Amino acid sequence: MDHSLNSLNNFDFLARSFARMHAEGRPVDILAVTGNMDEEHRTWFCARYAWYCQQMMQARELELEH
């Protein structure tokens, strides 16, 4: 819907859950974080690309992300 109302609100609440779901292996919508695209997000998604790739493919069963 909006990058400052929907994408921004998710970027804050998911920011703390993005790192928490990284060790737990839970589905996290990184795309929401890539919509704005940040300089630190480049190297961040490098390790979060593979992580989300193996945890989401194994998480897809009852819920998609959250």
CATH number at residue 41: 1.20.970.20
- Sign of dihedral through CA atoms 22, 28, 31, 32? negative
Are 65 and 29 in contact by the 8 Å Cβ rule? The answer is yes
d(CA 21, CA 51): 10
Structure tokens at 12: 């804050």
d(CA 3, CA 47): 24
Method: NMR
Pick the closest to residue 45 from 33, 54, 57 (CA basis). Answer: 33
For the chain, the domain total comes to: 1
d(CA 6, CA 42): 21
For residue 25, the enclosing domain spans 1-66
